[PDB]
Design an enzyme around this catalytic site. Structure first.
Site, mmCIF file in Angstrom:
data_model
loop_
_atom_site.group_PDB
_atom_site.id
_atom_site.type_symbol
_atom_site.label_atom_id
_atom_site.label_comp_id
_atom_site.label_asym_id
_atom_site.label_seq_id
_atom_site.Cartn_x
_atom_site.Cartn_y
_atom_site.Cartn_z
ATOM 1 N N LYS A 39 0.812 -1.197 0.077
ATOM 2 C CA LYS A 39 0.101 0.026 0.019
ATOM 3 C C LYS A 39 0.809 1.254 0.065
ATOM 4 C CE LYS A 39 -2.806 -2.695 -0.518
ATOM 5 N NZ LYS A 39 -3.814 -3.842 0.188
ATOM 6 N N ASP A 115 -10.179 -6.504 -5.898
ATOM 7 C CA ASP A 115 -10.682 -6.640 -4.681
ATOM 8 C C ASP A 115 -11.677 -5.268 -4.036
ATOM 9 O OD1 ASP A 115 -8.113 -5.920 -2.245
ATOM 10 O OD2 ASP A 115 -8.220 -5.230 -4.279
ATOM 11 N N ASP A 116 -11.350 -4.147 -4.720
ATOM 12 C CA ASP A 116 -12.175 -2.900 -4.401
ATOM 13 C C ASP A 116 -12.685 -2.130 -5.466
ATOM 14 O OD1 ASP A 116 -12.053 0.285 -2.810
ATOM 15 O OD2 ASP A 116 -13.430 -1.319 -2.026
ATOM 16 N N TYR A 158 -13.608 -12.943 -3.227
ATOM 17 C CA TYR A 158 -12.482 -13.575 -3.063
ATOM 18 C C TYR A 158 -12.611 -14.951 -1.679
ATOM 19 C CZ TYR A 158 -11.382 -9.751 0.182
ATOM 20 O OH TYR A 158 -11.207 -8.517 1.053
ATOM 21 N N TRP A 217 -4.926 -17.866 -1.281
ATOM 22 C CA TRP A 217 -4.312 -16.488 -0.387
ATOM 23 C C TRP A 217 -4.727 -16.443 0.846
ATOM 24 C CZ3 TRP A 217 -4.067 -10.789 -2.640
ATOM 25 C CH2 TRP A 217 -3.856 -10.021 -1.746
ATOM 26 N N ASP A 218 -3.885 -16.918 1.645
ATOM 27 C CA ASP A 218 -4.024 -17.241 3.024
ATOM 28 C C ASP A 218 -3.999 -16.292 3.901
ATOM 29 O OD1 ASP A 218 -5.206 -18.669 5.279
ATOM 30 O OD2 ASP A 218 -3.929 -20.287 5.249
ATOM 31 N N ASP A 224 -3.205 -7.131 10.377
ATOM 32 C CA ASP A 224 -3.602 -5.705 9.813
ATOM 33 C C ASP A 224 -4.994 -5.329 10.529
ATOM 34 O OD1 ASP A 224 -4.141 -6.191 6.225
ATOM 35 O OD2 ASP A 224 -4.684 -7.452 8.217
ATOM 36 N N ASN A 252 -0.376 -14.314 3.352
ATOM 37 C CA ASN A 252 -0.447 -13.091 3.548
ATOM 38 C C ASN A 252 -0.262 -12.831 4.944
ATOM 39 O OD1 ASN A 252 -0.915 -10.176 3.134
ATOM 40 N ND2 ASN A 252 -3.029 -10.400 3.890
HETATM 41 C C1 LIG Z 1 -7.672 -10.573 -0.683
HETATM 42 C C2 LIG Z 1 -7.501 -9.933 0.897
HETATM 43 O O1 LIG Z 1 -7.484 -10.836 1.537
HETATM 44 N N1 LIG Z 1 -7.590 -8.645 0.698
HETATM 45 C C3 LIG Z 1 -7.501 -7.822 2.093
HETATM 46 C C4 LIG Z 1 -8.279 -8.520 2.918
HETATM 47 O O2 LIG Z 1 -9.516 -8.491 2.707
HETATM 48 O O3 LIG Z 1 -7.825 -9.143 4.059
HETATM 49 C C5 LIG Z 1 -6.521 -9.203 4.406
HETATM 50 C C6 LIG Z 1 -6.459 -9.325 6.021
HETATM 51 O O4 LIG Z 1 -7.124 -8.299 6.705
HETATM 52 C C7 LIG Z 1 -5.576 -7.966 3.983
HETATM 53 O O5 LIG Z 1 -4.519 -7.884 4.332
HETATM 54 C C8 LIG Z 1 -5.978 -8.042 2.559
HETATM 55 O O6 LIG Z 1 -5.301 -6.987 1.860
#
Ligand SMILES: CC(=O)N[C@H]1C(=O)O[C@H](CO)[C@@H](O)[C@@H]1O
Ligand SMILES: [Cl-]
EC number: 3.2.1.169
Length: 424
Positions: A39, A115-116, A158, A217-218, A224, A252
Site C-alpha cells: 500500500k 478487490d475494491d 474472494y 491467498w491465506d 492488519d 499474507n
Molecule cells: C484478498 C484479501 O484478503 N484482501 C485484503 C483483505 O481483505 O484481508 C487481508 C487481511 O485483513 C488484507 O491484508 C488484504 O489486503
C-alpha cells in the site's frame, strides 16, 4: 506449484533488508514466490495509471534479482479497480503501458487486483457484468505478454461469505470462471477472509465454479485487521488433503517482518510434509528461530522454552496456544466455585502453574528488552506488555482467593489477554 508470500497487507512497507530477510526465510522453507504489492507504493493502486520512476523500476529489478538469487520468482501487483472504465481506450493503454513498462523491464509475473470496486459498473461500459469486464481487461493483459509471463487475478468476491455461502451460487464467479482465460490463476482465501479452516469439500466447490484450481491467498497469519494481535503460531486448520485441490499457496503474513518467521517456517512445512502436525512443526520453527534472539553484547540468546512460550501466547487467530490454554482451563475448572479452597490440591496445582506462567512471561519480557535485534524487540514489546499485565491481574486476583476471603467480599480494586479478561 506457486508458493510463498505476498506483501499485500494493510500496513507499512518493508525495507530492503526486511524483504531480503523474508526472502531467505521463504527459500529456506522450500517455497518459491515473492509477491510485491505494498500500500506504500502509490503506483500499485491509488495512482495506478502512473508508470514507475526510473528509480522505482530499479528498486523492483533489484528485488527480482534478490529473489532469483534465492531460487524464487517475483511478481508485481497492479490494482486498477477503483476508478476503472473497463472499455476506455485511454485506461486500456494506461494499463498496457504499466504492463509494458514492467514487461520490458523483464517483469512479466503479475498480479491484477480487483478487490475494491464501485457499487455499479461505470456508465461508459454497461459488458453484462463486472466479471466479464475484469475478465476482458485481464485477458488483454495476458495477450499483451504473448505467452511469456504469468498472471494471477484477485477477484472481487474472494471468499465464501462474499460469494453468498456456496461459491457455486455466485453469478460473478459463474461468469468469471467461463470468461477468464484458463492460463490466468485466481486467488481464494477460503470460506472467510481469515478462514479458521479450509476443507476439501469447500475447495471442490470453488474449483467447479472458477473452472480451475484456485491459488490460495491465506490470511490465517495476517494481523492488519487487529493490531492488538500477532500470530506466531503454526499454520492450522488446513488438512493436507486439500492440496490436490489448489493451484498454489500464498501467505499474507503479519505487518512486521520479524513476526513472520514461524508463519513462513510452518507454512512451508505444511506444503512439504505429508505428516505435518502443527505442534511438531512449531517446535522445529522455534529451534530454527532461536538464533535471532541473541542478547546484545553477549553470546547468549533468549532460551528456547521462552521463544516457544512467545509462540504459545500469540498463537492463532482462532486459538490460544496449547500450553497457555491448558493452564487457563485448569484454573477455570478450579474456579468452578466462588471460594476455591486453599487446601484443595487441584486449586493448589492450577494456581502454582498460573504463578509459574507469570514468572516465565516476566523473564521473556525482560529478556526481549535486551536483545540485539531491535526490530524483533519492537515487534513483540506491546503484545508482551499486555500479556504481562493481564497475567499480573489474574495472579493478583487468584492470590487474593488464596487467602480464603469471606464470600460477599469483593476483590480489592481469541488470544491471551481476552482469555484472561473472560475469567474476570
Ligand atoms: C484478498 C484479501 O484478503 N484482501 C485484503 C483483505 O481483505 O484481508 C487481508 C487481511 O485483513 C488484507 O491484508 C488484504 O489486503
Ligand atoms: Cl490513476
Amino acid at each position: 506449484m506457486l508458493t510463498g508470500v505476498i506483501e499485500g497487507f494493510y500496513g507499512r512497507d518493508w525495507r530492503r533488508d526486511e524483504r531480503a530477510t523474508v526472502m531467505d526465510w521463504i527459500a529456506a522453507a522450500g517455497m518459491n514466490t515473492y509477491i510485491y504489492g505494498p500500500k506504500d507504493d502509490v503506483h500499485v493502486r491509488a495512482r495506478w495509471r502512473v508508470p514507475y520512476d526510473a528509480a522505482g523500476l530499479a528498486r523492483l529489478t533489484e528485488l527480482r534479482d534478490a529473489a532469483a538469487a534465492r531460487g524464487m520468482v517475483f511478481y508485481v501487483s497492479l490494482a486498477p479497480c477503483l476508478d476503472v472504465t473497463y472499455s476506455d481506450p485511454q485506461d486500456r493503454a494506461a494499463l498496457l503501458a504499466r504492463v509494458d513498462q514492467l514487461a520490458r523491464a523483464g517483469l512479466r509475473n503479475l498480479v491484477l487486483l480487483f478487490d475494491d470496486i464501485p457499487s455499479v459498473l461505470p456508465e461508459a461500459d454497461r459488458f453484462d457484468s463486472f466479471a466479464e469486464a475484469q475478465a476482458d481487461l485481464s485477458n488483454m493483459v495476458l495477450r499483451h505478454l504473448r505467452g511469456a509471463g504469468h498472471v494471477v487475478f484477485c477477484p472481487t468476491e474472494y471468499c465464501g461469505r462474499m460469494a453468498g455461502g456456496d461459491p457455486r451460487g455466485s453469478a460473478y464467479l459463474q461468469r468469471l470462471g467461463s470468461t477468464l482465460d484458463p492460463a490466468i490463476d485466481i486467488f481464494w482465501t477460503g470460506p472467510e477472509i481469515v478462514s479458521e479452516e479450509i476443507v476439501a469439500a469447500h475447495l471442490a466447490a470453488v474449483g467447479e465454479v472458477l473452472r480451475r484450481r484456485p491459488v490460495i491467498w491465506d490470511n490465517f497469519h495476517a494481523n492488519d485487521y487487529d493490531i492488538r494481535r500477532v500470530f506466531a503460531g503454526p499454520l492450522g486448520g488446513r488438512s493436507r488433503d486439500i492440496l490436490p485441490l489448489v493451484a498454489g499457496w500464498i501467505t499474507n503474513p503479519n505487518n512486521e517482518a520479524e513476526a513472520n518467521f514461524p508463519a513462513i517456517h510452518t507454512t512451508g512445512a505444511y506444503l512439504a510434509d505429508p505428516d505435518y502436525a502443527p505442534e511438531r512443526a512449531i517446535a522445529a520453527a522455534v529451534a530454527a528461530w532461536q538464533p535471532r534472539f541473541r542478547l546484545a553484547f553477549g553470546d547468549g540468546a533468549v532460551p528456547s522454552d521462552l521463544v516457544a512460550l512467545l509462540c504459545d501466547l500469540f498463537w492463532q487467530p482462532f486459538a490460544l496456544g496449547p500450553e497457555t490454554t491448558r493452564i487457563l482451563s485448569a484454573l477455570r475448572a478450579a474456579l468452578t466455585v466462588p471460594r476455591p479452597d486453599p487446601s484443595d490440591p487441584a486449586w493448589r496445582a492450577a494456581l502454582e502453574d498460573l504463578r509459574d506462567l507469570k514468572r516465565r512471561i516476566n523473564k521473556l519480557f525482560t529478556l526481549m528488552t535486551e536483545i540485539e535485534n531491535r526490530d524483533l524487540f519492537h515487534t513483540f514489546h506491546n503484545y508482551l506488555w499486555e500479556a504481562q499485565e493481564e497475567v499480573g491481574h489474574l495472579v493478583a486476583y487468584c492470590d487474593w482467593l488464596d487467602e480464603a476471603p469471606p464470600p460477599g467480599a469483593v476483590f480489592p480494586a481469541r488470544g491471551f489477554g481476552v482469555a484472561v479478561q473472560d475469567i474476570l
